From a paper:
RAF-family kinases are activated by recruitment to the plasma membrane by GTP-bound RAS, whereupon they initiate signaling through the MAP kinase cascade. Here we describe cryo-EM structures of a KRAS bound to intact BRAF in an autoinhibited state with MEK1 and a 14-3-3 dimer.
We also imaged a similar sample that was subjected to cross-linking with Bis(sulfosuccinimidyl)suberate (BS3) prior to size-exclusion chromatography. The RAS-front conformation is not induced by cross-linking, as we also observed this conformation with the three-dimensional classification of particles in the non-cross-linked sample. Overall, the resolution of the cross-linked RAS-front reconstruction is ~3.9 Å, but as in the non-cross-linked structure, the resolution in the region of the KRAS/RBD is considerably lower. These crosslinks connect Lys150 in BRAF to MEK residues Lys185 and Lys353. Comparison of the present RAS-up and RAS-front structures with our previously determined RAS-free autoinhibited structure reveals that the constellation of autoinhibitory interactions among the CRD domain, C-lobe of the kinase domain, and the 14-3-3 dimer and its cognate phospho-serine recognition sites is unchanged. Rather, they appear to be two orientations of the mobile KRAS/RBD module that are sufficiently populated to allow 3D reconstruction.
Residue numbers in the entry:
A (entry chain F): 1 to 167
B (entry chain A): 151 to 201, 204 to 282, 360 to 370, 449 to 738
C (entry chain B): 43 to 274, 307 to 385
D (entry chain D), E (entry chain C): 2 to 230
Write the structure that this text describes.
């Protein structure tokens, strides 16, 4: 009854597509097939409501940012993904938030910060850094691993809950 | 514009994807993965270009469509094929295609030949792509040659780790001047240890390893083969043989590889160049093992720099990212490419004019041996084996004990199944 | 010009003196180099007394394909340019394809680069000029593309000439070459690793990837370390993945002028259309400057190899 | 009583013992009870498998017989063993044909079942035509021609072209043309006609009839692809 | 002549018929001449497949009997069919044992042949053990135990740790321990000891038996993994 338009954004390689495919099909993709554009639909019960999720999975490669911006303009809420082994992807969360503000013409857009690849050894973006960044924007932070599925549902369901709050 | 000549594809249920518009790739293959992620298969769908919706063939070269928008829909037509499962007891050696364990009693798909235990019905492929009793006993059916002895004769040809000459040593032998001319005292020791294993192999389908010689550099001494190699008989003269002899060649190659793997020897080089037809009858595999003479060392390490025709290298071997990529399953992939070469008579990727392109696309999991060039009479059971050998993920590939058995199973049912099909038994199944 | 016309006419004159090329007409003098697929020797043609280079490629291909390759290789008799290595005749014998070309006593730029450690920007300018002019000659006069541009195929002699060779004139020979052993490094442009030749643009990347390699004396993928740069074993699939999914390499900060760095960055664009074409590079600032410079290439080459000064 | 024998037949089918199922179905049809769908399908499967195993055995025996002709009198006993196999092959087909002459054909109140039984008669006559040579081959095939020609009409007039029984009849008739009469062009034309008619009238089947008809059509596509080359 | 009978038996084996093959090999054994190495495998395969078909039938029939879970005549008829197939299997096993203990076991010059025949005797006594439930079970169980102990003594004395016969005997003995006697601790102990001893002489693997050796090795590993859970 209720449709939610979710956009997954962030730097190349952070795991946007692997997270999305774990949500949709419960399968981990180990290949790295860079996205140009990919959209998905998934029906899911969240907090007792049967939800139709439109997942708009965008390119991390800035060469395709024009396509990303078209997806962002239709979206209602944004998963902003970085990888816990890529400090530039973490720093560039600010870039993605600014892009969202620009395309949505609004500073009041549902957003969730996702730190992905937490199954890896030798993690370099620590929990305190990540929680401070989420705090600085007043948004939730969810740790995920698309490989183990840890946090995947929590990330998307939290974004749906943020959109509901905003509605 | 072309932006890496891409094609935009609209998919069922308001979805979408972008694919590279690369010369030489079908629409089907460009879209295979996107469809699979959505539980679709090209054969259950139609594709159209926008021009307003005009149907295009799945085997279209996608590069003609750069800049265009395609749409994929379904029409719910033929559901591929449903598994016609008949309960069968196997009086001969059979293995469950899921669990690879012995299958005394179970189910057989009449159409596609898939075999599985009663306990594995939850693991059967959905589409027919054309407290239990413990098992029991099944049916029963210094090696250095010194100088002054090897009469090095005429130069035959250079390879990927050495040059082969026809030498005289108590009869005709094949001498091989290994490219590694200055081995360290550790590489020499490892090579001697490897030869220690290689000298203890004696099989009808394995070329005899008669040691080596250290005084005139390094020189593998193997049994000289008369006649010609399989590559010579398949791509030089193109003398195709009847399916019976082809399956027999595949069976003897699989038997030789099974003997090699029973002793834990990775071939690392199985290809149509190293398969000989001794007196046009006996299959003899050569140039096996010798991992220490390939990828010249810099010390006590043997980082495999990778060398060999990439047409037979498994994707895990192409990547080389793994610590050791030459496992049994890479040997199985090499055998599968040999099967493809035998079955179609053409080398894999006969539409690509670049070598580095093949390496990248194969190692990337983008390019696969096209299975649309096969003959129009090959039983589906046999073709399924070939498609199982070429699985990108190496863990899915079967081992040679299973491949030899599967080949032999259809070796006996070949003549009877060549006739036209017939009215099959109905469903007679239920789960 | 006048000297180039003189040399081309003299090469044609010396070429008419050679008739049918038989294997018995050659006496092997020396080996010149070897690769993963062929071996080249310096030899003397007894019937005409000339001294040439003979590349021997050993392919296991069907006789029809071999004969079509031999026939296609005869187009090289039309390539007559001061930036293209001279061709005397190709033939097949003893199971090997033999290609006869003029002897470049200076060798290939890979050997010169190994002998020199690094190559000066000023030399590289003339090198780039020659490479661009050869690519222009191949694209315009014959509508064929090199496809294999790298330092191993750029040849130089004691007379200061810089000529291209080992270009893809026989499509069937390339098709046979697709069944080759895996090399240790690639110069293939990123589009060719995912698609097909995007005209001469796909060559230009290689030239850039060559120049940087000659500019620093090191294969530039992956780019040098932070302290390896101040000092002024990746898998092949990893190299290709870096070529496709990573930013292209670039020259060091301050060791080279800005025109050369801009030239190489325009030559190494990951988008082939955004990457510069032959006409763009021909009128580049670095190209104009290196064309204005009066650099003594022959003497520098002889010095680097260790031979006494020529002329 | 009848249900007890049908349960015995099902249990024998699950046990892979087929001769007991053949006997338990022949004794059931011997009475002359109203034969429903499942009851006749069990008979069809039983009498298919029992003859199919022996036909595969005969094909293997004949293939071994012609492996090497330049040899001693080892083939002498091979052809006599094959003759014994035929002696245990023709008579069961005669037990099936006599059964079809006893109850099935007269006790038929539905054209679909009549087509099914006539197709079975034609199939067992085609089964006998392979081993039988000389004028016996002709005498056998002359019966199968009319058995299929008295069934195709009823299939066309009473049942849709997408019906699985009609598709099976067309498949068997094409195989009869190809293997026995050796008219591959007519067989290909018949198969193409049947497949085009099936495609022209599709997406009207029942929910259950979404596996068997697809199976027959995919076998038809396989045969068409095999016979094109 | 013996060669004609052996060729007929092999021809029937290639035809997937295991009734003429068993009769032909029974007639061969009735002559009372000692078999060669090749001729014994055909007998073993024939009298393994014949029993195996009944074993599969018995397994599926008992599964249906344990599945129905009702109160009707279906269960009674299923019990009658089970006792029928059990009587047939008993007849087959008794014919095998009568043909074994009168012409082969008392006249076996080769100790390897003695181990093979005692392994077969234990196998068929185990086949009879798993079906016969009651007082007669304790007789055949102890007979199989004695046969297997006699075979195992000779296997430990004069056999190779990598020979197919010794590995097969060990595998059948561990399965006998696990299924009949239900003592998995000693079965696991025996399996681990046998697998280690076969691991010992891994280099000594000639071409004569590499497939059988590694196949029995993998089957032992699978059973070990199944039993250690
Ligand atoms: N170990 C691990 N790898 C992951 C995880 N998520 C993604 N990856 C890997 O990281 C690579 C990039 O993933 P992908 O989802 O394509 O990233 P993306 O953010 O969508 N990239 P783009 O912006 O180009 O579309 C893939 O190889 C994928 O398997 C994770 O949680 N753990
Ligand atoms: N044991 C052998 N007996 C006879 N001829 C042989 C033997 N081994 C190789 N040759 C010949 O050697 C020729 C080329 O030498 P090889 O190095 O064996 O080629 P190659 O097999 O491609 O090299 P690798 O290392 O196996 S990839 C082949 O065409 C064969 O005719
Ligand atoms: N005309 C020539 N005159 C002199 N030496 C030559 C000539 N052509 C090639 N060479 C030598 O041969 C080597 C280059 O030729 P190739 O081996 O064919 O190329 P490559 O090194 O294999 O790299 P490729 O062609 O991209 S696989 C160098 O060692 C050169 O010195
Ligand atoms: O030489 C080649 N590849 O390198 C060998 C691998 O070691 C090569 C590759 C492709 C090609 C297409 N048409 C000719 N082709 C080649 N030959 C060649 C071409 C021009 C010249 I001047 C001299 C030559 F030898
Ligand atoms: Mg992505
Ligand atoms: Mg070269
Ligand atoms: Zn199937
Ligand atoms: Zn299983």
């Amino acid at each position: 009854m209720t449709e939610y338009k979710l956009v997954v954004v962030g730097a190349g390689g952070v795991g946007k597509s692997a997270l999305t495919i774990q949500l949709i099909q419960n399968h981990f993709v180990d290949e790295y097939d860079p996205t140009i554009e990919d959209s998905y639909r998934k029906q899911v019960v969240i907090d007792g409501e049967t939800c139709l999720l439109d997942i708009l999975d965008t390119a991390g490669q800035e060469e395709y940012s024009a396509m990303r911006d078209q997806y962002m303009r239709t979206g209602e809420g944004f998963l902003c993904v970085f990888a816990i082994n890529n400090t530039k992807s973490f720093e560039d969360i600010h870039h993605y938030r600014e892009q969202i503000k620009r395309v949505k013409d609004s500073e009041d857009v549902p957003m969730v910060l996702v730190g992905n690849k937490c199954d890896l050894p030798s993690r370099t973006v620590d929990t305190k850094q990540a929680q401070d960044l989420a705090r600085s924007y007043g948004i939730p932070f969810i740790e995920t691993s698309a490989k183990t599925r840890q946090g995947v549902d929590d990330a998307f369901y939290t974004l749906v809950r943020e959109i509901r709050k905003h509605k | 514009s072309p932006q890496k000549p891409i094609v935009r594809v609209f998919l069922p249920n308001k979805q979408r994807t972008v694919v590279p518009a690369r010369c030489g790739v079908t629409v089907r293959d460009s879209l295979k993965k996107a469809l699979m992620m959505r539980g679709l298969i090209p054969e259950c769908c139609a594709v159209y270009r926008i021009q307003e919706k005009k149907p295009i063939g799945w085997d279209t070269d996608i590069s003609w469509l750069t800049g265009e928008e395609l749409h994929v829909e379904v029409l719910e037509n033929v559901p591929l094929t449903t598994h016609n499962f008949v309960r069968k007891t196997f009086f001969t050696l059979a293995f469950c295609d899921f669990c690879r364990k012995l299958l005394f009693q179970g189910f057989r798909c009449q159409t596609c030949g898939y075999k599985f235990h009663q306990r594995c019905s939850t693991e059967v492929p959905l589409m027919c792509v054309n407290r239990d009793r413990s098992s029991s006993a099944p049916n029963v059916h210094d090696w250095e040659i010194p100088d002054g002895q090897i009469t090095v004769g005429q130069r035959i040809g250079s390879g990927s780790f050495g040059t082969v000459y026809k030498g005289k040593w108590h009869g005709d032998v094949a001498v091989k001047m290994l490219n590694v001319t200055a081995p360290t005292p550790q590489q020499l020791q490892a090579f001697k240890n490897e030869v220690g294993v290689l000298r203890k192999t004696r099989h009808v389908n394995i070329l005899l390893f008669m040691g080596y010689s250290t005084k005139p550099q390094l020189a593998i001494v193997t049994q000289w083969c008369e006649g010609s190699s399989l590559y010579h008989h398949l791509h030089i003269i193109e003398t195709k043989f009847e399916m019976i002899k082809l399956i027999d060649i595949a069976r003897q190659t699989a038997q030789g590889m099974d003997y090699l793997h029973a002793k834990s020897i990775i071939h690392r080089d199985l290809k149509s160049n190293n398969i000989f037809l001794h007196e046009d009858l006996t299959v003899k595999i050569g140039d096996f093992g010798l991992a220490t003479v390939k990828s010249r060392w810099s010390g006590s390490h043997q980082f495999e720099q990778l060398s060999g025709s990439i047409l037979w290298m498994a994707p895990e071997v192409i990547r080389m990212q793994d610590k050791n990529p030459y496992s049994f399953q890479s040997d199985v992939y090499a055998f599968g490419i040999v099967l493809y070469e035998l079955m179609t008579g053409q080398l894999p990727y006969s539409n690509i004019n670049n070598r580095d392109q093949i390496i990248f696309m194969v190692g990337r999991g983008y390019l696969s041996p096209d299975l649309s060039k096969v003959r129009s009479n090959c039983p589906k059971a046999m073709k399924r084996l070939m498609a199982e050998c070429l699985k990108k993920k190496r863990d899915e590939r079967p081992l040679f004990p299973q491949i030899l058995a599967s080949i032999e199973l259809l070796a006996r049912s070949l003549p009877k199944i060549h006739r036209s099909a017939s009215e099959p038994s109905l469903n007679r199944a239920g789960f | 010009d006048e000297q180039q016309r003189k040399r081309l006419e003299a090469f044609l004159t010396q070429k008419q003196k050679v008739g049918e090329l038989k294997d018995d007409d050659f006496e092997k003098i020396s080996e010149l180099g070897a690769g993963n697929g062929g071996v080249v020797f310096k030899v003397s043609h007894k019937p005409s007394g000339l001294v040439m280079a003979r590349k021997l490629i050993h392919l296991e291909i069907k006789p029809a394909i071999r004969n079509q390759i031999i026939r296609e290789l005869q187009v090289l008799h039309e390539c007559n340019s001061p930036y293209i290595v001279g061709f005397y005749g190709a033939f097949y014998s003893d199971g090997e394809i033999s290609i006869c070309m003029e002897h470049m006593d200076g060798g290939s730029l890979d050997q010169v680069l190994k002998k020199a450690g690094r190559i000066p920007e000023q030399i590289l300018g003339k090198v780039s000029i020659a490479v661009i002019k050869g690519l222009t000659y191949l694209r315009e006069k014959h509508k064929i593309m090199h496809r294999d541009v790298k330092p191993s195929n750029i040849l130089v002699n004691s007379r200061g000439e810089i000529k291209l060779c080992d270009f893809g004139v026989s499509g069937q020979l390339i098709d046979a070459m697709a069944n080759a052993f895996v090399g240790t490094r690639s110069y293939m442009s990123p589009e060719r690793l995912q698609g097909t030749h995007y005209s001469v643009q796909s060559d230009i990347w290689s030239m850039g990837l060559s120049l940087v390699e000659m500019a620093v004396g090191r294969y530039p993928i992956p780019p040098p370390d932070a302290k390896e740069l101040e000092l002024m074993p990746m898998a092949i699939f990893e190299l290709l993945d870096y070529i496709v999914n990573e930013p292209p390499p670039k020259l060091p900060s301050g060791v080279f002028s800005l025109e050369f760095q801009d030239f190489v960055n325009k030559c190494l664009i990951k988008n082939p259309a955004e990457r510069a074409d032959l006409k763009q590079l021909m009128v580049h600032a670095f190209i104009k400057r290196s064309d204005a410079e009066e650099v003594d290439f022959a003497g520098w080459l002889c010095s680097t190899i260790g031979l006494n000064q020529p002329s | 009583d009848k249900e007890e024998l049908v349960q015995r037949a099902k249990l024998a089918e699950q046990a892979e013992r087929y001769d007991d199922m053949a006997a338990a179905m022949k004794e059931v049809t011997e009475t002359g009870v109203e034969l429903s769908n499942e009851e006749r399908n069990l008979l069809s499967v039983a009498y298919k498998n029992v003859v199919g195993a022996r036909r595969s055995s005969w094909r293997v025996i004949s293939s071994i017989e012609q492996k090497t002709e330049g040899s001693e009198r080892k083939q002498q006993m091979a052809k006599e063993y094959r003759v014994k196999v035929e002696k245990e092959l023709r008579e069961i087909c005669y037990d099936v044909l006599g059964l079809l002459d006893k109850h099935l054909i007269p006790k038929a109140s539905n054209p679909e079942s009549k087509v099914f039984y006539l197709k079975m008669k034609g199939d067992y006559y085609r089964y006998l035509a392979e081993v039988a040579t000389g004028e016996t081959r002709n005498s056998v095939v002359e019966d199968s021609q009319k058995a299929y020609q008295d069934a195709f009409e009823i299939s066309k007039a009473k049942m849709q072209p997408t019906h699985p029984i009609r598709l099976g009849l067309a498949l068997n008739f094409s195989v009869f043309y190809y293997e026995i009469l050796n008219s591959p062009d007519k067989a290909c034309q018949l198969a193409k006609q049947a497949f085009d008619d099936a495609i022209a009238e599709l997406d009207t089947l029942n929910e259950d009839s979404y596996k068997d008809s697809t199976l027959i059509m995919q076998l038809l596509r396989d045969n068409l692809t095999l016979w094109t080359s």
